[PDB]
Amino acid sequence: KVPPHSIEAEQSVLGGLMLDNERWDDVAERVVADDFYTRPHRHIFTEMARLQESGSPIDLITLAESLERQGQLDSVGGFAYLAELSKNTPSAANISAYADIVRERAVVREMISVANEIAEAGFDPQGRTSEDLLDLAESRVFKIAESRANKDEGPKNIADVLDATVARIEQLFQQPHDGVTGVNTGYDDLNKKTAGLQPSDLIIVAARPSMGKTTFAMNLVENAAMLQDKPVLIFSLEMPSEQIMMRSLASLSRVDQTKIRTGQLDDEDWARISGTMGILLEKRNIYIDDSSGLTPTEVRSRARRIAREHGGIGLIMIDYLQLMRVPALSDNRTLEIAEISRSLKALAKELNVPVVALSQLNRSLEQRADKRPVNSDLRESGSIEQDADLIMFIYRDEVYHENSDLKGIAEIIIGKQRNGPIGTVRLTFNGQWSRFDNYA
Amino acid sequence: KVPPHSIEAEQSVLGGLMLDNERWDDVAERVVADDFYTRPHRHIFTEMARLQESGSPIDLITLAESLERQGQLDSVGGFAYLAELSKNTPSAANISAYADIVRERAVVREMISVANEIAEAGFDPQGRTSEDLLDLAESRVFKIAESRANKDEGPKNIADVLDATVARIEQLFQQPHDGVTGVNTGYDDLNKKTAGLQPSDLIIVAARPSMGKTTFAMNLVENAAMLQDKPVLIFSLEMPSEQIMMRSLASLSRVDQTKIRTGQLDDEDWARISGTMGILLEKRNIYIDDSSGLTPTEVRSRARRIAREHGGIGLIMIDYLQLMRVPALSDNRTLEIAEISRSLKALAKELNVPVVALSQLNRSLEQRADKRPVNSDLRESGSIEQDADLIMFIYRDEVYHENSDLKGIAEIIIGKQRNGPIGTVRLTFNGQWSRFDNYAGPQYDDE
Amino acid sequence: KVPPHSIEAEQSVLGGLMLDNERWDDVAERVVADDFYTRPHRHIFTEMARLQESGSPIDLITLAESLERQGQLDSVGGFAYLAELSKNTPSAANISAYADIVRERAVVREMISVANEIAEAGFDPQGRTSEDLLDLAESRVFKIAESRANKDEGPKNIADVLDATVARIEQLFQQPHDGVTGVNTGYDDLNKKTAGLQPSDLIIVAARPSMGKTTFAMNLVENAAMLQDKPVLIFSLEMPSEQIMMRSLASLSRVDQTKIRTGQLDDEDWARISGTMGILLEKRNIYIDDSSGLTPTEVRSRARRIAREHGGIGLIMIDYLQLMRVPALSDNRTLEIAEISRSLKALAKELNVPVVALSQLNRSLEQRADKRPVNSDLRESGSIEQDADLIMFIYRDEVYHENSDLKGIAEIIIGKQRNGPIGTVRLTFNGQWSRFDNYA
Amino acid sequence: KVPPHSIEAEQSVLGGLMLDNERWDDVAERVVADDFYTRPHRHIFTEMARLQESGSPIDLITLAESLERQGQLDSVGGFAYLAELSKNTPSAANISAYADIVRERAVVREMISVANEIAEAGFDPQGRTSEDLLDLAESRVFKIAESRANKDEGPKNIADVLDATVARIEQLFQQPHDGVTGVNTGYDDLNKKTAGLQPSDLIIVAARPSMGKTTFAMNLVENAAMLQDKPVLIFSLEMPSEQIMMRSLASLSRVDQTKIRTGQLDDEDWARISGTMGILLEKRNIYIDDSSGLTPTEVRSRARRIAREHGGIGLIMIDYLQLMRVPALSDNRTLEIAEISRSLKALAKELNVPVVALSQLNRSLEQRADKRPVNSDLRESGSIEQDADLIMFIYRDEVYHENSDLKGIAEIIIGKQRNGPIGTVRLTFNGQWSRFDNYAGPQYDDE
DNA sequence: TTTTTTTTTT
Ligand SMILES: Nc1ncnc2c1ncn2[C@@H]1O[C@H](COP(=O)(O)OP(=O)(O)NP(=O)(O)O)[C@@H](O)[C@H]1O
Ligand SMILES: Nc1ncnc2c1ncn2[C@@H]1O[C@H](COP(=O)(O)OP(=O)(O)NP(=O)(O)O)[C@@H](O)[C@H]1O
Ligand SMILES: [Mg+2]
Ligand SMILES: [Mg+2]
Question: Which of A46, A76, A79, B68 has the CB geometry, 3.0–4.6 Å to B73, for a possible disulfide?
C-alpha cells in the first residue's frame, strides 16, 4: 500500500521557508525533518535548520551552497530541483495549515508503522507472553500520544492566565462549600487547615513502624469513601488485603481488632460488621491492589484503567514509597525515590486526584532528644519534600515515653503545606478499635 | 498469513470434556466458544454449554443426539468426527493448560485483527482526524486489555475481599483452635499475644551473642514439630548441625548440655535420648541444611523442592541473617539486608509459611543506660522493621547485671506486632539443659 | 569420525520426561541441554526446562505449543516427531541410567573436543611457548574434571543428623585419645584443647607477620614433622626459603637469630644446626614450594599435583595470608578472607590436610587501647571474628605494650573453636631464638 | 600433517660437534638422540655419544670409521652425507640455541603424539571409565612435564635445600666483612635493614609532591657516586638537570639552595662548590638525561649503550614512573604502568644494577587520619607491588601538622622488602641545604 | 581515574 503523504504540502512549506524566514519558527514548532515523507525533503529541512541555527537567512543560494558543502546537493535532486521548489510556491500565508497537514500525515504513518510492528509481534511471539505484547502495544500507543501532545507547551500571555484565574475564582465563589475545598477528610480540624484533600496534591504522611500510620491512612480512606461517591484506589503493597479489611472492620464498627483476628466475635458485633459490609456494597467504590514491587508506570496504567472504566478516581492510596521498585534506577535508592515521586506527582497532576502516599523515617529522630519529626527525618528526603505539597508527621509521645500524659493523643504535625500555615492536629487514637477520632 | 491457532489443544479440550464433566467449570471460566478457531468447534462448545446448563452429563451420545436435534451434527463434521475427538484425547488432567493455550491463541488473533482494523483506519481516514483515530486505537487496546487479565483475575476490588474476609472469620469462629490460629509455639503466653505462628509472617528474634537466641529458636522448632505434622526446614548457617542437635537433645530430654558436650552420659539419659530419637524418627519432619552463605534464591529453590516432595513446609528456620550472602549486593551490607528481607518476605507470602529469621543487634545497646533492645538497635535493620510483622527481642538482665533478680527470666519483648498490641513475655531459661519454658512464677506486668 | 553419542537414550529420557514429571529432578541433576548430541534435542530439553520452571507439567501438547510460540516447532522436526518420541518410550523406570549414559557420552565428546584443541595448539604454536601449551592443557583437563563434579548441597534428613551427632558424642565420650587426636601440634595446651592438628580443618592464626606468628607456624611445622614422615608442603608468602630456613634453625637449635643471620663463627651453634638438619634429613618429608600471589583453587590443584608426585600431605604452611590480595576485594578484605577461608576448608576436606593460615591484622593492634586482638584490631572484623573454624589471635603484649603484661604468658585467644574450650591460651615465647614454647 | 621439526638445526648441531668437541657437554645436557627428528640423525648422535664416552675425539673420519664398523654408515646416508653435514655448519658458537630449538621441537612432537594417544583412547574407551581416561590424560601430561622436570622447577626438596642451607651458612660466614652487601646507601640505618642497594632490585621510593623524594633520591645518588667508581645514569624526566645540579651542589657543599638559586653566593661557599666540582670531575661517573616522555625501550637502549661504552652502570635513576610514557599502552594508565614496571624489572635483572625508580601517591592518604603511606596508597598500585622488592615511603608529620615534634625527622617506612624485615628509618632533613643525614637523636622503638 | 549526594552502621 501507498503510505499516506502530501508531497505538495511539503513543497509549499519548503518554498515558503525559502521566501519567508519569519514564519520559520512556526514550521520548526510544528514539524521536524522526520515528518517529511521523502528523504531528500528531510535533508533539505535539516540543512535549513542548520543554516537558521547559524543565523544565516534561508535563501536558495546559501541552501544550495550548504548542500554542496555537505555533498547533499546531488542527492536531493540538484540545484534545478531547488529552483523548481522555490518557483512553485506562490506564498506562505497558509504555511501553518500545510505544516499541520504534514504533521497529520506523519502521525498517521507513524500509527500505521506501529500497527505493522504490533501485527509482526503478534505473528511472531518469539517466546513473549500475551501480557508482554499488551504492555508493548500500550507503551507504543502512549508514545504516539505523547508525540502528538507537543503543541500544548508554549509561553502564553498574562491575559490568558488572568482570564483562567478569574473564571476559576468566579467558579469557586459561585459554588458553596463551607470550607470543604478538597475531598472531605472526616476530621473537623483537618478540614480547617487543609480545607479538604485538594486534587493534584502529593499527600505524604510518614511515620515510624507500628505507629498507626497505615491505620490512619485507612481511616482517611474510609472517611473519604463515606463522604464521596467517586471511586478510590488502594495500593497495599506491604499490608495484605485481609489485614486491611480486618482493620477497616475494626475501625468502622468500633470493635477490638484482637477478637476479630481471633474470630471470637459475638452476634451483635457480627450484625454491626454485616451492616458495615452492606454500606460497603452500597458504595462498591474501593479497589485494593495488594501486589508489591510495582513500577509507577504500572500504577499509572491501572489508575488510567480505573478512571476510564469508573469515571475518574476519588483517591489513590499507596502503602509507602520505600516499597516501590523501579528496575531502571534500582542501583541508587535516592534516584529511584526521586523518579517515583516525580512520576506520581505527574500522575496526580494528570488525573487531578489527591494521592495519599505514605513513607518511612530515619533513625536520627531517635538520636535527637526531641523526637518530633522534621523534614530531614524523612527517609531519603529532599525530592520527597520538593515534589509533595501536603506533608504531615505523626507524633505520639505515649509511644516514646511511658510516663507521657499524651496517651491516646496523636499529634499529626504538618511538615509542609505550600498553601496555608502548617500546624499540629491532636487526635484520639484507639489501639483496640484502631480508630482515629477528633480530639475534644 | 495463517492465523495463530492450536487445533490440537481444542480437540484435547473437547475430548476431555466428553470424558470428564467435573472440570467443565474451569473451561467455562477460562474460555468460551468464540475462543475456538474453527466454527464447528464453536458449535460444539455452544452445544456442550447448552447441555451442561440443562444439567445433562457431557458424553458422546447425548451430545450427538443434541446436535442431531438442532441439525448441527453435519455442521460440526459428523458423529465420526466427534468419536475421533473423544478417542484422541488420553486424559483431561492438563485441560486447564490447554484452555490457557486456547485463550492465548484467541487473544493473539484478536490483537492481530484489531491491528488490521487500526491499519485500515490509518490508510483510510474517512474524514476522521488524527485525534479520532488515536482515541479509536486507545479504545480498541483498552477493550483487549479488558479481555485479558481483567477483573476476572481480581487485581483490585472490594466485594471479593469482603467475601474472603468473612469466610476466614467464619472459619476461625467455627474452628476450635482456642486462641492458637497459627502454628503452635508451645508457649501459652506467646500463643496469647501472637496467637501462634501465623503463616506468611517474617519472625525476627533478635538478641546479643550468648543469649540463647539459636537455643530459643530451636526450642520453638521442637515445639512446632511436636505440635504439628507438616515438615519443617532448618537453615543452620551459623552453628553446625551437630551442636544444634546436641542442644535439641539437651532441651527435649532435659539433660545438661555440658555433660553431652563432654559425652559423659549415664544410661538413663541415654535411654531418654533414644526415646526422643524414636519420636523424631516417627515424625521425620525435620530437615537441616547447614550450608553457609546461601543466597535467598537457593533457599527459595530448596523450600520449593521440599514443599513439592513432602507436601508443603510447616516452618522455615534461618540461623541469623547476616550470614546470608548476596553476591550481587555484597558491595553494601544494607542493600544485602534489604534484598534478603524482601526475598524472604516474598517467599513467606508465596508458600504461606511462618519464616523464623534470627538477627543480631547493635553496640548501642551497651551504650544506653537501659539495655532493652529496640527496633533501631537491630544490626542494620533498614527494611527489617518494615517487612517483618513478628519482631521480638531477647532481654537477659542476668547477663548484663550480676545482681539482677531476673536470673533465668528471659524477657521476649515484641518490638513490632502489626495485628495486635505489643508486650513482654517472660520465660524461664535453663542454661544447663538450654531450655526455654513458660514462666510459672509471679506474673509481672508488661510495662 | 562419528562422535560417541546415544540418541536412543536421549529419546528414552525425553519420552520418560513426557510421561513422568516426578523424575524430572533426577534428569535435571544429571544432565543439561548441552549434553544432548543433536541441537533439536537441546531445544526440546530447553523448552522442557522452561515449562517446568514455570510450574507447568511437561506433556506433548504444551511442549509443542511452546515450541510453536518460540517458532522452534518446525526446527526440531515438527509435532509428528515429538509424538513419535513420546510413543517410542515405554516407561521412565530406568531414566536415571539413560541420563547417566547420556552424561558419559557428553563428557567423552567433550574430552575428544579438548584433545582436538590441544592437537591444534600443538600443530600451530601461534608464538606460545611449550610451557604455555602444557599449562593450557592442564587447565583444560582440570576444567573437564571440575565439570565432572556432582551434587554438593542438600537439606540433610533428621536421621543423618542424628547419626552424625551420636557419632560425635561417642567420639567425645568413648575414645580415650587423651588430648591429641590428629597430627600433634607440639604445644601442650594446643595438644589438650585443639586435640592436635586435626586433618580436614581450618586453623587460621591471626597476628602480625614477623611478630611471633611466623615462628609459631614454623614451630607447628617442626613439631608435626618430628612425629611423622608424611610429606609436608611449604607455601610461605612472607619470607623466602632461605629466611624461613634461618628462622627454623634458630627456633629448633635455640640459637639467637642475630648469630644465624649475621655470621658469628662458632662450632657449638654449627653442631646444633648439624643435629637439626640431621633430624630433618631423617624425617625427609619437607618439600619446599613457597611462592606468592595465588588463590586457594590453585593451592588445591597443587595439592592434587603433589599427591600425584608422592601422595598424602602432612601439613601446608600458609604464611602471610594477606599476601594473596585480589585488587577487586583488596579494599574490603573481609569478604576476600572469608572466601579464601571457605576454599581452604574445601581443600582441607578434599585431601585430608590440616590447612593452617597466617592471617594479618591491622596496625591498631599496637594503636587501639584494647591491645588484645578484638574487632577493632581485626582486619575490618568480619571473617576474622567468624567463618574460620580455629581463629587463634596472638595477643603478644610484648610488642603492643612496652611494659608488657604478658611476658611468657602471651595469650593465644581463640575466638571460635570447634573442638576444645575457647579462651586466652598463655604461651611462652623466646624472642632471642624466635621460638614459641608452651606455658603451663 | 607434517610433524614440527627443524632439520637445519640438527645439521648445524652435528656439524658443530664434528668441528668442536668442547661444547659436546652442553649438547648432551640439553638433548638426546631421541630429540633428533630423522632416524639417521639419531644414529649419528648415538655414534657420537658412544665415541665420546670412549674418549675418542669427534671428527669426520673417526665417526665414519665407527659407523662403518657397526654397518650404520649406509643407514645414515653415507660418507658423502657426513661430509656435507660437516661442510654446511660454519661455526658452533650458537649450537646451544640450536639444541634448545631441537629440544623444543621434540617437546612439541611428544605433546602431539600424546594428544593423538589421548584422542585415540577417547574415541575407543575399551571399557575404561571417564575417570580412567581422565587419570590417563593427567598422567601423560605429567610425564611430559616430568621430561623437563630439571628444567622447569622452583624450590628444592629437603636434602637439596639442606645442602643449600649449609652452603649459605658458609657464605654468610664471609658476610660480616663490611655489613653492606650491595651498593652503599651512605646511611648507617639504611645499610642495616636493606644492607645497601642490592643489584637487580626495583627500589620504589614514593612520596607526596614537594616531599623531598627527588631530593632524597639525589642524596642517595651523590652518596653512591662518592662511594663507588662505577658510572651512574640519571633520568631526570620531571625536573631539568639545572635544578638537579643546584640541589646536588646545595646538598654536597651544605650551602642554602635559595642563595644558589638567587646566585648571591660568597667566595668561601664558591670555593666549596669549586672543590665539589673538582671532586666530581675526578669522578666523572654521572650521566644525566633530562628528556621527558621516554619509553622503557629507549631507556634500555641507552643503558645498554652506556654499559657497553663505560663497562657497566653503577646506578640507574628514574624521576618518578608516571612521567614515563608508552604510546602503545597510552589508552590505559594502569596497563602502561604495569608494562613500564615489568620492562624496568627485566632491565634491572638483565644488567644486575639497582634501579632508582621513584613514584607518586594517591589522595586517599590525606583522607586517612593517619597519613602514613601504605602499599595500596600507591598511585596506580598492584603491579608495582608485584614487580618491586624495595618499596619505601617518605613520611613527614611536620608537613601535615604544624605542631608536630618530628620537625626535621623524615621517616622512610619500608612497605615491601622481599629479603629482610621492613622498618622505619628516621633521618634528619635540612631544608636549607636539602640534605638528608642520619638521625643522630634518640632512637624511637617502633611500636 | 576523578567527582558529587544520600541512608545505614561502628
Ligand atoms: N488489637 C490491637 N490492640 C492494640 N493496638 C493495636 C491492635 N491492633 C493494632 N494495634 C496497633 O496499631 C498500630 C499499627 O500501626 P501500623 O500503621 O500498622 O504501622 P505501620 O507504620 O503502618 N507499619 P509500616 O508502614 O510497615 O512501618 C500499632 O501501634 C499496633 O500496636
Ligand atoms: N632553599 C630551601 N629552603 C628550604 N626548603 C627548601 C629549599 N629548597 C627546597 N626546599 C624544600 O625541599 C623540598 C623539595 O623536594 P623535591 O624533591 O623537589 O619534591 P619532589 O618530591 O621532587 N616533588 P614530586 O616529584 O611531585 O614528588 C620541599 O619540601 C621544599 O620546601
Ligand atoms: Mg504502614
Ligand atoms: Mg620529584
Answer: B68
Same domain? For C119 and C176 the reply is no
CATH of residue A75: 1.10.860.10
In a domain, C43, yes or no: yes
Domain end marker among A123, A156, A191: A123
Name the residue of A204, A205, A208, A213 whose CB sits within 8 Å of the most ligand 1 atoms, as the mutation to test its pocket. Answer: A213
Instruction: Kindly report which amino acid residue has its CA closest to the C1' atom of nucleotide E9.
Output: B380
Q: Which domain holds residue D31?
A: 1-123
Identify whether residues A202 and A269 lie together within a single domain. Answer: yes
Residue with cell 644492607: D195
Q: What is the CATH number of the domain that holds C239?
A: 3.40.50.300
- Nearest-CA neighbor of B360 among B234, B214, B233? B214
D175 grid coordinates: 658476610
Provide the grid cell at A189: 480540624
CA–C1' gap, C268 and E9, in angstroms: 59
Q: Which residue is nearest to nucleotide E7 (CA to C1')?
A: A380
Q: Is A214 in the pocket of ligand 1 (CB under 6 A)?
A: yes
Provide the experimental method for this PDB entry: cryo-EM
Those residues whose C-beta lies under 8 Å from the C-beta of residue A366, and which sit 6 or more positions away, are B374, B376
Report how far apart, in Å, the C-alpha atoms of C385 and of each of A379, B361, C419 are: 32, 16, 17
CA angle B238, B241, B243 (to 5 degrees): 85
Residue D373: strand, helix, or coil: coil
- Specify whether C110 is located in the same domain as C189: no
User: How many Å apart are CA A204 and CA A198, to the nearest integer?
Assistant: 13
Cell of B149: 487479565
The total number of structural domains in chain C stands at 2
Closest atom of ligand 2 to D432 CA is 3
Domain check: are D117 and D182 in the same one? Answer: no
In a domain, B134, yes or no: no
Show the cell assigned to C97: 541410567
Annotated binding residues of C for ATP, written as ranges, equal 210, 213-214, 418
| CA–CA separation, D89 and B208 (whole Å) | 84
C-alpha grid cell, residue A1: 500500500
Residue B418 CA, nucleotide E5 C1', distance (Å): 34
Question: How many CB atoms within 10 Å of residue B435?
Answer: 23
- Does a structural domain hold residue C209? yes
Residue B288 with chain C: CB contacts under 8 Å: 155-156, 158, 161
B345 and B422 together in one domain: yes
Q: Do B86 and B208 belong to one domain?
A: no
Of C25, C65, C165, the CB nearest to B246: C165
Ligand 2 proximal residues by C-beta, below 6 Å: D 207, 209-215, 238, 256-258, 320, 431-432, 434
| Cα-trace Rg, chain B | 31
**Residue nearest (by alpha carbon) to ligand 2 atom 26:** D209
CA A44 – CA A15 distance, rounded (Å): 11
Q: Out of C65, C158, C173, whose CB is closest to B286?
A: C158
Distance from the Cα of B46 to chain A's closest Cα (Å) equals 26
Q: How far is the CA of A384 from the C1' of E5 (A)?
A: 15
Query: H-type helices in D35-78, by residue range?
Result: 39-53, 60-70, 73-76
Last residue of a domain, one of A123, A150, A177: A123
Nucleotides, chain E, CB distance < 7 Å: 1-3, 5-10
Q: Is C61 close to B233, i.e. CB distance below 8 A?
A: no
Do B109 and B184 sit in the same domain of this protein?
no
User: Within a domain: residue B189?
Assistant: yes
CB neighbours (10 Å) of residue B124?
10
Q: Burial letters for A50-83: b for 16+ Cβ neighbours within 10 Å, e otherwise?
A: ebbeeeeebebeebbbbbeeeeebeebbebeebe
Strand order in D355-359's β-sheet?
D286-289, D232-235, D315-318, D355-359, D202-206, D390-395, D409-417, D424-430, D435-438
